[PDB]
Each structure stands twice: as structure tokens, then as C-alpha cells.
């Protein structure tokens, strides 16, 4: 968080309340049309009524495709799941590509669970059965309640409980002076140790003595837990916590991703629907961002047709900087973004344009502000000129070397000379390519 990454300045889409894109806002400069389209996509995600909708961000490299997707994620917030993914990740040594894609699809659909946990804490002061003056059957003693006195820091309360708790109290070996908690939703007694006030400095027990609970005896709170469908799928496919031989084998054997079946996923969907209907949970459909989609092969693209046509799928955002490239897995088949035309029919294309020199200068200034770098006007203009040639990424990468060089020289700002020296020290792709072409004999291969 404290370290500054490449998209650390993107705090969202700089959109007006009417959806029009401001020239420079929220860390984004230019790309007004793409930003407006991404705002419409953000509204689509927030509406939560659409499934399997796909958006393709198409444009030359360094045009804000990843920045726009991250701005969408910022607009949605941390509540909405956002699963980034590169196309190269489907190639796994454990599971098939379609399984990786399906798992990433299920990661984007989130579920928020709200429950109230009501507990009674305290140190047991009293443990008294409530006998009845008329014993049932004539002989012996019959009990109708068990009074448990619970003491905390700021109170003491007595609880008239069911007689059946006498067995739980004996199983937990609860005596006076022990700290216990009773859960209302289950009616079970759990002994969380003995009070520390009865412990002497000469005792050696570790987990036996616990502090007297603070607060009130009756504690109730609302627990909000955020889970994804993939979490439930994985927890049910390779369960952890059993005491049978299969769980022991799972602990012993090396963990391995498996091809989760449609049966388990359908069961998870049924449980999620039951929770939603009961009011326990609220569905949070999020976004799957697949950067470098062109690295997917023809099998992945074909599977995406069925994946996107589903009614449970999230909203998928693709991104590709390729032109009329050859689809991977095929022999000499060319498509406009490295993506077969069947999948292009299922996506909405957002075009990202190149940056004018003024927008490049603005982005450089923003990046300098983010990195804590003071840059003079002449140095900024020179760096923008450097960015007109070469590329924008090259110019924004000279800021920290130039700042370091200035600091070594003993100056608190980047001057033009620092940028010139850095430009001399480091080469861009085009200059290196010129050197390589001029000396192709001396290089290898």
C-alpha cells in the first residue's frame, strides 16, 4: 500500500454526475469517450440484473485499458468482487484451461452474509438447580431449571436455563469461577477456561486461566461475512477439518486443484439461493477482468461462449492491444484483436485512443505528484518532448531515476539537466532497436 505501483494514481473515473467525463479528474486524463462507456458499464454492474455481459477494451498499448479497468474497480468499491486475471494463467499443470476460467468466473460472483451472534459471557458464580415441590413419579428429585450466574466486568446476570444443560455443564466440567459462554442460537455451553483472579504466580498452566470478560454478560452483534461462490466450491471439494481417514489423506497429500463438478456447483447455487430467500445473504455479482485475452487459445475462446451465455456469469472485461493477429491454437487464422469473430459478436468494444502531447504532460505531472517528485516546468516540457518520441511509459519511468540523480547532486527538484542525463543513461525500445539493427552481426541469433 505504501509502495507506489504503476496505477497508484487512478482513484476512479473522473465522471460528472451526468456521466460526462471531465478532462482530468480522479487521476485520469483524457480518454473521455472510453471513460463514459466505462461509467455506463459501472452502472450495469451496480444494477445487478445482468449476467454474462462482456466488454472488450481495444486500443494500442499504453492507452489506459488496465487503468480504465482499475478505475472501474475503484468506482465499484471493495464490496464488489473484482478478480484480475491475465490470459497466460489458464495454462496450469494441475487443471484444464476451462476449469481455470470457470473458477475465475465463480470468484467474481460474491455473497454477503449477515447474521446476529448472541452470546452470554461470564464467570460462573452460581450453579443451582430449581427443584419442584412435587417430584414427578413420587420418588427422587425433579428439576425444572438450572440457574447459572454469569459475572463480567460491568455487571452480573442470572439465567434460568433448560434442565438439559446439566449434561453439557458436566461434559465441559464447568465449576464456579470458570469463564464460559452460552450461545442462544444453539443452546450449548462452552468453557473458555478459568478466571485469572484465582491464578497464583506459582501456577504453570498456559491456556487454563483467562481474563474476566469485559462489557456486558449478554453480547449480540451483527456479523457481515463476504464470501465468493469459488470459496464455497473449493471448501466443499477439498474439505478441511474432518477427523476421518479422507481428511487425514487430504492433510498428508500435496494440495492440488481439481475439476470441480457441476453437481457441487449446482448444490452451492441451491444453498446460496436458499440463503438469499431466507434473508441471510445478499448476492454481489462482480467483475472478472481478463487482461491479455489474446493469450487465450481457441479452446478457451470457444468455452467463453457457453460461459458468457450463462445466467450466473459475472460481467467480464477483456483487454487486448493486438491488431490482425493469429489466434493461438489455430494454424494461420487471423482475427481483428487476436479474438475469434464469434466471441467479438458477444462483446461491446470500447476504443482507447492515443494521447496528445498535452495529455501526456498531464499524466507525467500526475505520476510525479504520486511519486513525491518535484519537477520544474522546463524539465516537465523536456520529458513531454521525450514522450512525444519514444513512448509515454518511458517518460514516466525517468521520473524516479532523475529524482535520485538530483538528490545525489543535492537538489530537491528535477531540472532539465537531470532528465537529459537520465535519457543518456537509459535507452528506450526504439533506440535499442536502432542499435541492434546497426550491429546485427555482433549480436546473437
Partner 1 sequence: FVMPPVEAPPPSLHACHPPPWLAPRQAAFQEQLASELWPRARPLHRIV
Partner 2 sequence: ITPGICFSTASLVLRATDVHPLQRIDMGRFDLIGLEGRVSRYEADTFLPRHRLSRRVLLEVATAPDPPPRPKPVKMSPFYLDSLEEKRKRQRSERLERIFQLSEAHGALAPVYGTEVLDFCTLP
Partner 3 sequence: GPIITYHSVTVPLARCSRTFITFSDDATFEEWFPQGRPPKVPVREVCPVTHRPALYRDPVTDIPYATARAFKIIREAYKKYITAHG
Ligand X SMILES: Nc1ncnc2c1ncn2[C@@H]1O[C@H](COP(=O)(O)OP(=O)(O)O)[C@@H](O)[C@H]1O
- Span 228-267, contacts to a second copy by CB under 8 A: 245-246, 248-253
Site string for partner 1, 169-188 (x = CB under 8 A): --xxx---------------
Q: Which residues bind partner 2 (CB under 8 A)?
A: 113, 115, 117-119, 181, 183-186, 188, 219, 221, 223, 225, 227, 232, 235-240, 263-264, 267-268, 271-272, 274-275
Q: Does 245 bind partner 1 (CB under 8 A)?
A: yes
List the one residue from 201, 222, 377, 424 that touches partner 3 (CB under 8 A). Answer: 201
How many chain residues interact with partner 3 (CB under 8 A)? Answer: 29
Site string for partner 1, 99-138 (x = CB under 8 A): ----------------------------------------
Q: Least distance to a second copy from the beta carbon of 97, Å?
A: 15
Local structure of 75: helix, strand or coil: helix
Residue 115 Rama label (left phi>0; alpha psi -120 to 50; beta): beta
Residue 60 in marked binding region: yes
Q: Which does 62 bind (CB under 5 to 8 A by kind): ligand X, partner 2, a second copy, none?
A: ligand X
d(CA 302, CA 424): 48
Q: Does 30 bind ligand X (CB under 6 A)?
A: yes
Residue 370 in marked binding region: no
d(CA 73, CA 289): 10
What are the backbone dihedrals phi and psi of residue 85, each rounded to the nearest 5 degrees, phi first?
A: -165, 140
Strands (DSSP E) found in 274-359:
281-285, 287-291, 315-320, 325-326, 334-335, 347-351
Q: What is the number of other CB atoms lying within 10 angstroms of the CB of residue 54?
A: 22
Give the pairing type, strands 178-183 and 109-131: antiparallel
Q: Are 233 and 265 in contact (CB under 8 A)?
A: yes
Which DSSP string corresponds to 350-394?
A: EE-PPPPHHHHHHHHHHHHHHTT--B-HHHHHHHHHHHHSS-HHH
Q: Does 294 bind partner 1 (CB under 8 A)?
A: no
Site string for partner 3, 121-140 (x = CB under 8 A): ----xxxxx--x--xxx-xx
Known binding-site positions for ATP: 59-66
Residues of this chain that interact with partner 3 (CB under 8 A) are 125-129, 132, 135-137, 139-144, 162-164, 166, 170, 175-177, 197-202
Residues of this chain that interact with a second copy (CB under 8 A) are 245-246, 248-253
Amino acid at each position: 500500500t505504501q509502495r507506489i505501483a504503476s496505477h497508484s494514481h487512478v482513484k476512479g473515473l473522473g465522471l460528472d454526475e451526468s456521466g460526462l467525463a471531465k478532462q482530468a479528474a480522479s487521476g485520469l486524463v483524457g480518454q473521455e469517450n472510453a471513460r463514459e462507456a466505462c461509467g455506463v458499464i459501472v452502472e450495469l454492474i451496480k444494477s445487478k440484473k445482468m449476467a454474462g455481459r462482456a466488454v472488450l477494451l481495444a486500443g494500442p498499448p499504453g492507452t489506459g485499458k488496465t487503468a480504465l479497468a482499475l478505475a472501474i474497480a475503484q468506482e465499484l468499491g471493495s464490496k464488489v468482487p473484482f478478480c484480475p486475471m491475465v490470459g497466460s494463467e489458464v495454462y496450469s499443470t494441475e487443471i484444464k484451461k476451462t476449469e481455470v476460467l470457470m473458477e475465475n468466473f465463480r470468484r467474481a460472483i460474491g455473497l454477503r452474509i449477515k447474521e446476529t451472534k448472541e452470546v452470554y459471557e461470564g464467570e460462573v458464580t452460581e450453579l443451582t438447580p430449581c427443584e419442584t415441590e412435587n417430584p414427578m413419579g413420587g420418588y427422587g428429585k425433579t428439576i425444572s431449571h438450572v440457574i447459572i450466574g454469569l459475572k463480567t466486568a460491568k455487571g452480573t446476570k442470572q439465567l434460568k436455563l433448560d434442565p438439559s444443560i446439566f449434561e453439557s455443564l458436566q461434559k465441559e466440567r464447568v465449576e464456579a469461577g470458570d469463564v464460559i459462554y452460552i450461545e442462544a442460537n444453539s443452546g450449548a455451553v462452552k468453557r473458555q477456561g478459568r478466571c485469572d483472579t484465582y491464578a497464583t504466580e506459582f501456577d504453570l498452566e498456559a491456556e487454563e486461566y483467562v481474563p474476566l470478560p469485559k462489557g456486558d454478560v449478554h453480547k449480540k452483534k451483527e456479523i457481515i461475512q463476504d464470501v465468493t461462490l469459488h470459496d464455497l466450491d473449493v471448501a466443499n471439494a477439498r474439505p478441511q477439518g474432518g477427523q476421518d481417514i479422507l481428511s487425514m489423506m487430504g492433510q498428508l497429500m500435496k494440495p492440488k486443484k481439481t475439476e470441480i463438478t457441476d453437481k457441487l456447483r449446482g448444490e452451492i447455487n441451491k444453498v446460496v439461493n436458499k440463503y438469499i430467500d431466507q434473508g441471510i445473504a445478499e448476492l454481489v455479482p462482480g467483475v472478472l477482468f481478463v487482461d491479455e485475452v489474446h493469450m487465450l487459445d481457441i479452446e478457451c475462446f470457444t468455452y467463453l461462449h457457453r460461459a458468457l451465455e450463462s445466467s450466473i456469469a459475472p460481467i467480464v472485461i477483456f483487454a487486448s492491444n493486438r491488431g490482425n493477429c493469429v489466434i493461438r491454437g489455430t494454424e494461420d487464422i487471423t482475427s481483428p484483436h487476436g479474438i475469434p469473430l464469434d466471441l467479438l459478436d458477444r462483446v461491446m468494444i470500447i476504443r482507447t485512443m492515443l494521447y496528445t502531447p498535452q495529455e501526456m504532460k498531464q499524466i507525467i505531472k500526475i505520476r510525479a505528484q504520486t511519486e513525491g517528485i518535484n519537477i520544474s516546468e522546463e524539465a516537465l516540457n523536456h520529458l513531454g518532448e521525450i514522450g512525444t518520441k519514444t513512448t509515454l511509459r518511458y517518460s514516466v519511468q525517468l521520473l524516479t531515476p532523475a529524482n535520485l540523480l538530483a538528490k545525489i547532486n543535492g537538489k530537491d527538484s528535477i531540472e532539465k539537466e537531470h532528465v537529459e542525463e537520465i535519457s543518456e543513461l537509459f535507452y528506450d525500445a526504439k533506440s535499442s532497436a536502432k542499435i541492434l539493427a546497426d550491429q546485427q552481426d555482433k549480436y546473437m541469433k
